[PDB]
Every structure is written in structure tokens, then in C-alpha cells.
Amino acid sequence: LDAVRKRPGMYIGDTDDGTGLHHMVFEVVDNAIDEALAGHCKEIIVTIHADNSVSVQDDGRGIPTGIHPEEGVSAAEVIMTVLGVGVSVVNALSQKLELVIQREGKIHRQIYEHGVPQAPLAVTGETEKTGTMVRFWPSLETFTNVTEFEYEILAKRLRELSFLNSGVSIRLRDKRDGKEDHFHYEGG
Amino acid sequence: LDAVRKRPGMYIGDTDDGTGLHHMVFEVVDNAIDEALAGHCKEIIVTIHADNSVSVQDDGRGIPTGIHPEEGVSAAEVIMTVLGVGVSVVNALSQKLELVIQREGKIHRQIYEHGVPQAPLAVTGETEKTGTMVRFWPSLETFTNVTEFEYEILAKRLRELSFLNSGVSIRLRDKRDGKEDHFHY
Ligand SMILES: COC(=O)c1ccc(O)c(O)c1
Ligand SMILES: COC(=O)c1ccc(O)c(O)c1
Ligand SMILES: Nc1nc2ccccc2[nH]1
């Protein structure tokens, strides 16, 4: 990920005017939609947390967790740490990123800071559900001037996205003020 | 550098008991000694600064600055960012590292933060002098418990090095309390 770290703007867009900041969310959402589309229930939830982190979760299959034969780490870690621009760009430019994967009856958890995993992906428990959750805190060493998420920017885009992605339920929650929206277009 | 950032302990040594912390200095010192050995005056100066950083300077020829033909960045940057363990390890585990190279009539400078160059190596002025200087601020995200340099730990090692590298003068200065030593065999 050092190539992204060296020139963040070339990968995410403008890091000073808020456009790159919001691009972080939309990159994660694109992955979540892809996950949601492969399942039959298809729901994603985007939450703006009070600490100005954002989490995106889907109830899909859960991204793969098995050890990659060549890389020697979990598939999820490979996706997060090897160079849409890819979620690895978001990970690189996040001061913290939490990953939770529910798959095959197991809960997998991992934490990253500035793209660096704090430990290997670990099975911490059991679950009856499936899905992936990523919560990230944009790096304040990279994102300057505009550092807080604008609800309207997210809601507008998620609304547009719902019409292209039929059957996918999209929820947006702002924990700073309690605002909620639900974008679900059932065409097709 | 992510392999280093991922398992700092495996590259530099224990990051909680002060071992790894001091090894950071010794890695830089190895490079400085090599550089000093190739020069005429043969002196390195190791300084513990009051803000808990350490600088190591030599009066050697200056490490190479030209663009690496294959990597496409300065040779110094290649050495600082591509995997003794190598100074790239120190760079990766330093929240800030400042590099100054005096060579071929010019002064060159570069800043890194957590091993990431903030800009390319750049010519900032002219000079008659030659040598290299690295000042590094160990990352406190990595180094825990023992975060302050112990003078005697540095002095002990530097003394051993002065006997082995007998033509080289080694100066140790502590700007916190003014203690200093001069190892020369
Ligand atoms: C590559 O997959 C991801 O990074 C990813 C997938 C699904 C999600 O719900 C999410 O928040 C992130
Ligand atoms: C690659 O060389 C170095 O990293 C290096 C060389 C000489 C020095 O005086 C120093 O502090 C560092
Ligand atoms: N604070 C901070 N910034 C970083 C950039 C790259 C790797 C680790 C880092 N820790």
C-alpha cells in the first residue's frame, strides 16, 4: 500500500475539498452492494457514527476468510492490503478500520491502523448470520479541511444507487442527529 | 515496508522492553560507520535530542542521490523504503525521519513519516561539505513502555564498535542533560 500512501490524491481524489473523503464511503458501498447482490435478502446499512467514522454492512455471504495459498494470510487481509479503486485504498487512508465477517457459522474480526493489520483475522465467536461489516475512521493526516461526513452527499448518492440495484435495500443512519433514510427500489 | 510495520518485533527486536528502541539507533549507526570508513575524516556523531529523537551524522562522501534506474526514485529513497536489517526498518518504525545528504557540492533533504516520503529527495542549497545525516523520531505507536533512550545503552554499544572500527571517531552527545563521550581507538 505504500504507493497509495505516497500519493493519496492520485487514488482517492482531492483530500482537501471533501470529495476524496466521501469517495472513501462510496468505494466501500460499491463492495457492499456487490456482496448484497449475490444474496437473496440483499440489505446494506450505512451508518455515520458520532465519532465521524462510517460503517457499511451487508447481509450477504461474507467475504472469504481462508488463508490465501501464496500470500499466506486470510483472503480478507489480501483484499484489504494489496493494490473502483479497491477497498485497500480506503484501508490505507484510514487511521483505523474494523472488519467483521460472519460466514460458515463463525464471526471473524480484524483491526487495521493506516492499512496495517494489528493481528491476523481471528475467529472470535459463532453466529447464525452472514455478512460483512467495515467501519473506518478516515485518516486525519491525509484528509484535511473537510473532515466530517455530509449526510446529504451520502443520501443523494445512495438514492441514485438504489435505482440501479434492484432488490437491494439500502439504509442510511446518522447517529449524530438520529436522521434515517431507506432507499429501496424493487424494480425488475 | 508493510511487512515491517506488520511485525515490528521480528525486524527490530522487542518493542516493549527498550531492546527494539535502542536497536533503531544501532542500525543507523552501522550505515554511518560504513560511510565514515570510506571518507577521510572518519567521524560519526550520535546525538540524543531533547524531544526524544536521535540523529546520526557522518563526514563521509554522502550516500548516493541519483535516480535509481529501475526503481525510478532517488537511490537514497530506494534504500529508505525497500527491504543487518537495513535502515528501511528504522524508517518504517519512525513517526518521522529526516534525511540530509551533502554530496557533490549540494545539500539534499527529505522527510519521511512512518516510512512514507513526504516529497522526493530535493536539492536545497550548496555546500563544500560531504556526509549524511539521519534524525529519527521513533514511532510511539510501535514502541511502548520504554520510550526514552538510555544513554548508557548507546554508550556501551558505541564503545564496542569503536574497537572494531578502529580508525573511526565516534562522538555521543545527550542534549537532555549534557552528558557526552568520545570513543576513538
Ligand atoms: C471487499 O469487500 C469489502 O471491503 C466490503 C464488502 C462488504 C461490505 O459490507 C463492506 O463494508 C466492505
Ligand atoms: C543508507 O545510509 C544511511 O541510512 C545512513 C548513512 C550515513 C549516516 O550518517 C546515517 O545516519 C544514515
Ligand atoms: N500515524 C500513522 N500514520 C501512518 C502511516 C503509515 C503507517 C502507519 C502510520 N501511523
Among B78, B112, B132, B169, the mutation site with the greatest number of ligand 2 atoms within 8 A of its Cβ is: B132
Give the mutation candidate from B7, B116, B140 for the A interface (greatest A CB count, under 10 A). B116
B6 vs A contacts (CB less than 8 Å): 116-117
Q: What are the residues whose beta carbons fall under 8 Å from the beta carbon of A102, sequence distance 6 or more?
A: A62, A108, A127, A129, A130, A131, A132
Q: Closest residue (by CA) to atom 8 of ligand 1?
A: A32
Q: After which residues is chain A broken (C to N over 2.5 A)?
A: 83
- Residue of chain A whose Cα is closest to the Cα of B92: A2
Cβ proximity of B109 and B138 under 8 Å: no
Any catalytic annotation for residue B70?
no
Hey, are the CB atoms on B113 and A141 less than 8 Å from each other?
Answer: yes
Tell me if chain B has a CB within 8 Å of the CB of A109.
no
Q: Distance between CA A147 and CA A18 in Å, rounded? A: 7
Active-site residue identified among A27, A35, A43, A77: A27
A3 half-sphere exposure, CB direction, 13 A CA radius: 10
**Cell, residue B23:** 536497536
> What span, in angstroms and rounded, lies between the C-alpha atoms of B50 and A81?
36
CB atoms under 10 Å from CB of B147, counted, come to 14
| Residue A26 near residue A157 (C-beta atoms within 8 A) | yes
Closest CA to A115 of B3, B24, B85: B3
Instruction: Give the Å distance between the CA of B5 and the centre of ligand 3.
Output: 9
Calculate ∠ Cα B89-B91-B94, nearest 5°. Answer: 110
Task: Report residue A93 as a C-alpha cell.
Answer: 487512508
In sequence order, the β-bridge partners of residue B98 are: B111, B135
Helix (H, G, I), strand (E, B) or coil at B21: helix
Q: Could you tell me if A136 and A48 are in contact, meaning their C-beta atoms sit under 8 angstroms apart?
A: no
CA torsion, points A143, A146, A148, A149, in degrees to nearest 10? -100
Residue of A nearest to B5 (CA): A116
Please report which ligand is nearest the Cα atom of A33.
Answer: 1
Q: Where are the beta strands (DSSP E) in chain A?
A: 43-48, 54-58, 94-103, 106-113, 116-117, 122-126, 131-138, 169-174, 180-184
Instruction: Classify B58 as helix, strand or coil.
Output: strand
At residue B127's C-alpha, the angle toward residues B125 and B128, to 5°, is 165
Q: What's at B122, amino acid-wise?
A: A
Measured at the alpha carbon of residue A131, what is the angle toward residues A129 and A132, in degrees to the nearest 5?
Answer: 140
Helix runs in B38-150, H state only = 75-81, 87-92
Q: How was this structure determined?
A: X-ray
Give me the resolution in angstroms, 1 decimal.
1.8
